[PDB]
């Protein structure tokens, strides 16, 4: 059985869902004040945290990540709200072992704010994409994709909530197939 690690930069809502249905070795955050650390404390999940400011370069930053992953014998790294590009240091160690979820029907609206990009565009449907991570930005092999509709009386809050709910149901399903 694979040992799973989770990277979350913010609220860590996806981490909450994963940790409830899958045993998580530990969860990392690039923000020492992220709320995902609070959830880990409540779920009894090990949690590490260090910022980019504490390193000379991004290479040294990702070097600490690799050492941390290798120490816990991590077999799969789930990016659940990790708002940072995966550099070559981390890719060289965990190529084809890193999955990521994206609040957009790739390759439509890639980036950090795929929700706002799709909402400002006026497209009738967005989606949720779970894929592998390579050198490119959101250009990995797609594992699972679903469409998320846009309503008439939809605010940016109502629309964002529909995407996140789609993420909470899709992520455990995809991991369930990859976990074993």
Which residue of 45, 78, 81, 170 would you call a contact of Cl ion, by CB under 5 A? 81
Segment contacting Cl ion by CB under 5 A, of 54-62, 63-71, 79-87, 172-180: 79-87
Q: Crossing angle of helices 156-178/13-21, nearest 10°?
A: 30
Q: Least separation, in Å, of the C-beta of 74 and Cl ion?
A: 20
Segment contacting Cl ion by CB under 5 A, of 38-46, 49-57, 80-88, 124-132: 80-88
Site string for Cl ion, 14-53 (x = CB under 5 A): x---------------------------------------
Q: Least separation, in Å, of the C-beta of 144 and Cl ion?
A: 15
Establish whether 102 is a catalytic residue.
Answer: yes
Of 102, 113, 131, 164, the active-site residue reads 102
Using CB under 5 A, count the residues that bind Cl ion: 5
Confirm or reject binding of residue 13 to Cl ion (CB under 5 A). yes
Q: What is the DSSP string of the chain?
A: ---EEEE-SS--HHHHHHHHHS-EEEEEES-TT-THHHHHHHHT--EEE--GGGSSSHHHHHHHHHHHHHHTT-SEEEESS--S---HHHHTTSTTSEEEEESS-TTSS-SS-HHHHHHHHT-SB--EEEEE--SSTT-SPEEEEE--B--TT--HHHHHHHHHHHHHHHHHHHHHHH--
Nearer to Cl ion, 82 or 94 (CB): 82
Segment contacting Cl ion by CB under 5 A, of 24-32, 41-49, 73-81, 119-127: 73-81
Nearer to Cl ion, 13 or 139 (CB): 13
168: left (phi over 0), alpha (psi -120 to 50) or beta: alpha
Confirm or reject binding of residue 103 to Cl ion (CB under 5 A). yes
| Catalytic residue numbers, as ranges | 102
Applying CB under 5 A, which residues contact Cl ion? 13-14, 81, 102-103
């Amino acid at each position: 059985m694979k040992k799973i690690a989770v990277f979350a930069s913010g609220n860590g809502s996806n981490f909450q869902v994963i940790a409830e249905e899958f045993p998580v070795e530990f969860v990392f955050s690039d923000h020492r004040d992220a709320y995902v650390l609070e959830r880990a404390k409540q779920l009894g999940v090990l949690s590490y945290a260090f910022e980019l400011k504490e390193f000379e370069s991004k290479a040294d930053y990702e070097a600490a990540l690799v050492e941390l992953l290798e120490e816990h014998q991590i077999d799969l790294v789930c990016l659940a709200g990790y708002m940072k590009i995966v550099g070559p240091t981390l890719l060289s160690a965990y190529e084809g072992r890193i999955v990521n979820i994206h609040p957009a029907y790739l390759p439509e609206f890639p980036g950090a704010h795929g929700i706002e990009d799709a909402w400002n565009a006026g497209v009738g449907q967005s989606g949720v994409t779970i894929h592998w991570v390579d050198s490119g930005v959101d250009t990995g092999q797609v594992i699972k994709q679903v469409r998320v509709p846009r309503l008439a009386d939809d605010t940016i809050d109502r629309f964002e909530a529909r995407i996140h709910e789609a993420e909470y149901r899709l992520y455990p399903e995809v991991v369930k197939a990859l976990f074993t």
